[PDB]
Swiss-Prot record, chains A, B:
SUPFAM superfamilies per record: alpha/beta-Hydrolases (SSF53474)
Protein's UniProt name: Cholinesterase
Role played: Esterase with broad substrate specificity. Contributes to the inactivation of the neurotransmitter acetylcholine. Can degrade neurotoxic organophosphate esters.
Disease link: Butyrylcholinesterase deficiency: An autosomal recessive metabolic condition characterized by increased sensitivity to certain anesthetic drugs, including the muscle relaxants succinylcholine or mivacurium. BCHED results in slower hydrolysis of these drugs and, consequently, a prolonged neuromuscular block, leading to apnea. The duration of the prolonged apnea varies significantly depending on the extent of the enzyme deficiency.
One cellular component (GO) term of this entry: plasma membrane
Location in or out of the cell: Secreted
Length: 527, 527
């Protein structure tokens, strides 16, 4: 039996055998009042205190969210869909601890991605029991509200202030500050880590005054708040909040009434209308996301970044070789996960319309000009490869590289990885290559489970990443020091050295996508 | 009609249409007295002067040499065998000039490889008419004596001093100094270039006082004089000269008599006995090569290199990704060009005996230790891949990298390439990868001939190399400046930046084979 006393009550966890050893798991600990009724659209309210033993023995409800129905029965897509009931009562977290109870363990806090519209901490690829077993860190993950329920904004007004779901993450970092010593954890050594929108989240907690003292270091996998999808403008957020009201017949004139009306709606009615709050979107649409709210976020975060207004600490930042591909089967003409997707120039062109909706014509010609100077015009997969690079360079790679540069210019050590390994078990076709989202199972150690059909070179690869991730968290330095590993150089403006992660040989390289990102970074923002 | 007047007489060349243009070719110009009879084994003697018109309208005789009979009918091997008659009367050279006659053209002088035992300037892959047409440089190549006829040494004695075939190259560089203005060439801008033994040759002319003022710059492709096969010791050279005498019944006691006897032998008798002058050799045996003769070479050239005693000028130095593979089918157990050559640990072991004949047992275990720490022990082509890396790292790659470092430490600009492209037309099997010898056709522009079945990406690749090679020669800087090409950084000790040459993207990388060459370079020389 394993009972830990927390500030709000006792909690019982469960034992798990992992690799001939044991991890204790406390799945489903609540960390705020359920955000129902009067609390819907508001900042999470702190938790009341319960006598008796809360049983943390299974994953909790995931937050309400639309589901990916594009490929029913297909594991590639459905592995991302929620795997516990949806409910507004989803404000729970998970703790995994080494056995025996560590004395003062480093803490890794996972923040999932999903475009801020979806996702859940209980996915199999986010299971932190391998990290606990293997590295003897503590792993914490949390559910936070996504979609309108988590990010609806009517700026300035506490009935729907914006950013609630970032406040959910925050209040969870707080629970770790107050509660994690009880579990053997060191609150003074906490590293946040997250992928995609979860990484953008990590980057904004680097910017948020309220989060500054709730963690030590940050890891950002395929995401940063300067990505084009990551922050909704005040303009767009209002449009969207009013468009939502309109669609649920909740148009009022007293904004406080719009909200009271929206709180009478039922979760499905709200969910059902999210996709149409925008005239057009893309497979990468973030209808309801982070906004400048004057609370969590005090100013446009591009301004905060440029002017050095963020927590000073080491960062680890990374991306995957084919970020963009996964999106092309969600609406680009001629693409399919069921064939090789050789598209035409005219298809490439119609695809830019898919991903770059408004979108001066000259903007889009400029993307075509930059990405279609073939070397040479012979290769039939030319336009298929260009569309994916366009999508992942614009959306992930250049914004992560620009974040890393700017961040590092203020004096902190920063390490950048280029993930190039395609999973031996990937269900998506070969042409989609090293996809967005598919480093996560390496980071979490799923390939250390031999029962599991990954190659030997994949176990070794993941053991190494685990070790680098954990050394980063405990010591601010992502080195694997024991096995004659390539040394991971800090990333500096000027050199921009990054490390490549793959099964064959890892390399030190410089200036990832220098030519592409000059385009996205200097020129495109102008169109 | 095209007649040029030279210091020794007039010479007539022939016109050639290349790429809708014209190159003049003067194939077969003699540059020394034929080294027959009394002259066999002696330094080339200067040419007499002829009235009338010498017709330079076909390639001349190749020098006497053993031929590769391992794969009769096989183009991969037979493309290297001589393609003009063998004769001792082989001291000729070739000049290719742009049409119209250039005014003061940069000169590229090619020196072929072949282990110093074979080779000829008239191979199809050494045809300089594309370089002349495309870059408007002048291309010169020369035959020089190989085997015992070119390198037999009985140190100190002018009847067989050693290095005759290096003196043949030299006297040819001289003919260019005296004669090339006549052809529109600039004697003050000459770059030597050569592959394998031809590159080792280029590196020794960097060391030879007599060659200092006969050229401007040097290019070394897969070869340098510090390679283990490149310089025969005084010890070994005598053994070999006496062993040769012995085998032809020419043992005497008056060394001048040994030689007179050897000059009565006929070329075949000499050729026929070369292979056995050593108790054992390897596929990489250089029975009769360069020696320290106190004339061409004044001291062990490792000492000259270390202590900065070489011509001060820019160098371009390169190697191919799979240098070693080509040698494994010439005697390593379990290898064959006709299958995938998955060998066993015990085969790998017997192969080290093939390539490392004497060869402490501990020496060889040490190679096995360094090269067989698998990552991981699963992969069936593990030992096949290790044997080739062993062979090419020991024989080519580390010695070229060490030459480049040491050379550059004295202040000169140096550029290093890593050639990684496998020819679409390679006849050797896939497992032998990017083979030794197979950059040459890219350097010489054979892929610019579209008639010819190379891919489009190969034309582009070769056009770029041609341009970099030619800019290096004319301007000491191997940049392709017009087409947004990756800039080629100088190679410094400390950084050791090199440029990768391939069809996809060229890269800047650092410290090629750092771990391997620490082994070959610091440790192995000790065993
Ligand atoms: C800000 O919002 C308006 C609202 O328009 C929308 O009405 C919503 C309830 C929803 O159904 C949505 O799909 C619909 O478009 C946008 O105005 C619309 O914009 C498009 C193009 O400008 C027009 O074709 C529509 O006719 C127009 N609708 C109305 C009623 O005015 C507006 O575009 C939007 N701003 C953006 C681009 O985000
Ligand atoms: C690769 O498949 C795409 C996707 O479209 C198809 O999915 C296939 C696997 C098959 O079931 C097909 O019937 C289904 O429609 C193909 O793109 C489609 O091309 C077809 C041909 O006319 C068009 O009708 C569709 O508009 C277009 N689909 C969309 C909406 O994008 C594609 O042609 C196919 N190409 C290959 C084999 O390279
Ligand atoms: C220096 O040369 C001697 C000569 O040995 C050789 O006789 C030649 C004419 C030729 O046929 C060659 O194949 C033959 O070996 C070398 O002596 C020989 O070395 C090996 C191993 O040491 C012995 O097994 C031989 O019996 C021995 N021969 C004689 C007659 O002494 C000697 O090895 C060589 N040095 C090297 C290693 O290059
Ligand atoms: C790949 O081939 C090698 C080379 O030997 C063979 O060449 C083959 C293409 C075939 O004609 C064969 O008969 C010829 O001998 C094989 O290595 C050989 O292995 C055989 C099997 O007993 C031995 O008899 C030989 O000693 C050995 N040859 C030598 C001298 O190296 C090799 O086994 C084959 N392996 C594969 C298919 O991976
Ligand atoms: C646990 O260690 C505490 C501090 O450790 C951390 O120091 C921080 C500044 C940060 O660098 C982390 O990465 C370090 O690990 C110490 O003050 C506590 O008292 C310790 N608590 C125990 C053992 O109960
Ligand atoms: C031809 O140019 C001559 C010198 O050109 C070279 O200068 C050298 C020092 C070297 O750098 C080469 O790479 C240069 O190209 C000049 O002195 C001759 O007079 C010229 N001859 C002519 C035009 O007839
Ligand atoms: C907590 O789980 C344990 C199982 O042993 C048990 O005491 C009890 O059923 C649980 N408490 C509940 C269900 O509230
Ligand atoms: C709007 O009416 C609502 C009713 O609760 C109230 O929240 C708010 O004070 C009113 N605002 C004004 C002053 O119009
Ligand atoms: C270090 O090496 C051992 C044995 O070579 C291996 O089992 C282990 O996976 C390595 N550890 C790390 C941290 O990569
Ligand atoms: C040189 O070639 C030309 C061909 O026109 C001719 O004058 C003559 O036959 C040649 N001289 C010889 C063969 O010595
Ligand atoms: C050896 O005899 C030859 C005969 O030509 C001669 O070259 C040389 O002077 C003699 N050497 C001596 C002094 O034994
Ligand atoms: C430069 O570019 C043109 C057109 O893009 C091409 O035809 C040519 O091969 C290039 N030249 C060099 C030196 O590579
Ligand atoms: P991520 O959360 O996967 N996301 C950024 C918006 C890609 C949809
Ligand atoms: P190269 O001339 O090909 N050579 C160096 C000895 C390899 C046989
Ligand atoms: Cl092409
Ligand atoms: Cl490594
Ligand atoms: Cl790149
Ligand atoms: Cl393996
Ligand atoms: Cl390039
Ligand atoms: Cl390497
Ligand atoms: Na532009």
């Amino acid at each position: 039996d394993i009972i830990i006393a927390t500030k709000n009550g006792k909690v019982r966890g469960m034992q798990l055998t992992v690799f001939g050893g044991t991890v204790t798991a406390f799945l489903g600990i609540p960390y705020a009042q359920p955000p129902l009724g009067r609390l819907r659209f508001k900042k999470p309210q702190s938790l009341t205190k319960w006598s008796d033993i809360w049983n943390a023995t299974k994953y909790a409800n995931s937050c309400c969210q639309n589901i990916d129905q594009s490929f029913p029965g297909f594991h590639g897509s459905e592995m991302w869909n929620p795997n516990t009931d949806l409910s507004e009562d989803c404000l729970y977290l998970n703790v995994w601890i080494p056995a025996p109870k560590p004395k003062n363990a480093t803490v890794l806090i996972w923040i999932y991605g999903g475009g801020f519209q979806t996702g859940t901490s209980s996915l199999h690829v986010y299971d932190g029991k391998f990290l606990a077993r293997v590295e003897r860190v503590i792993v914490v993950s949390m559910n936070y509200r996504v979609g309108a329920l988590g990010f609806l904004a009517l700026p300035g007004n506490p009935e729907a202030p914006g950013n609630m779901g970032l406040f959910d993450q925050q209040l969870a970092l707080q629970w770790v500050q107050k509660n994690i010593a009880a579990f053997g954890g060191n609150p003074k050594s906490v590293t946040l880590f997250g992928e995609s929108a979860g990484a953008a989240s990590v980057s904004l907690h680097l910017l948020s005054p309220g989060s500054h003292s709730l963690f030590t270091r940050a890891i950002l996998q395929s995401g940063s708040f300067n990505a084009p999808w990551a922050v909704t403008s005040l303009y767009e957020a209002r449009n969207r909040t009013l468009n939502l009201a309109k669609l649920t017949g909740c148009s009022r004139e007293n904004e406080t009434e719009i909200i009271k009306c929206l709180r009478n709606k039922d979760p499905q009615e709200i969910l059902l209308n999210e996709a149409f709050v925008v005239p057009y979107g893309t497979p990468l649409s973030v209808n309801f996301g982070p906004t400048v709210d004057g609370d969590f976020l005090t100013d446009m975060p591009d301004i905060l970044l440029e002017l050095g207004q963020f927590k000073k600490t080491q960062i680890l930042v990374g991306v995957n070789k084919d970020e963009g591909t996964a999106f092309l089967v969600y609406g680009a003409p001629g693409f399919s996960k069921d064939n090789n997707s050789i598209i035409t120039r005219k298809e490439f062109q119609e695809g830019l319309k898919i991903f770059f909706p408004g979108v001066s014509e000259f903007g889009k010609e400029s993307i075509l000009f930059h990405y279609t100077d073939w070397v040479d015009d012979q290769r039939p997969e030319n336009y298929r490869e260009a569309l994916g690079d366009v999508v992942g360079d614009y959306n992930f790679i250049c914004p992560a590289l620009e974040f890393t540069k700017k961040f590092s210019e203020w004096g902190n050590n920063a390490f950048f990885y280029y993930f190039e390994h395609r999973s031996s078990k990937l269900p998506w076709p070969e042409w989609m290559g090293v996809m967005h989202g598919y480093e996560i199972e390496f980071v979490f150690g799923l390939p250390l489970e031999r029962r599991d059909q990954y190659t030997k070179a994949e176990e070794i690869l993941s053991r190494s990443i685990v070790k680098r991730w954990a050394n980063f968290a405990k010591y601010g330095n992502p080195q694997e020091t024991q096995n004659n590993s390539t040394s991971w150089p800090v990333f500096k403006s000027t050199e921009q050295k990054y490390l490549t992660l793959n099964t064959e040989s890892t390399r030190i390289m410089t200036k990832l996508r220098a030519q592409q990102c000059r385009f996205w970074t200097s020129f495109f923002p102008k169109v």
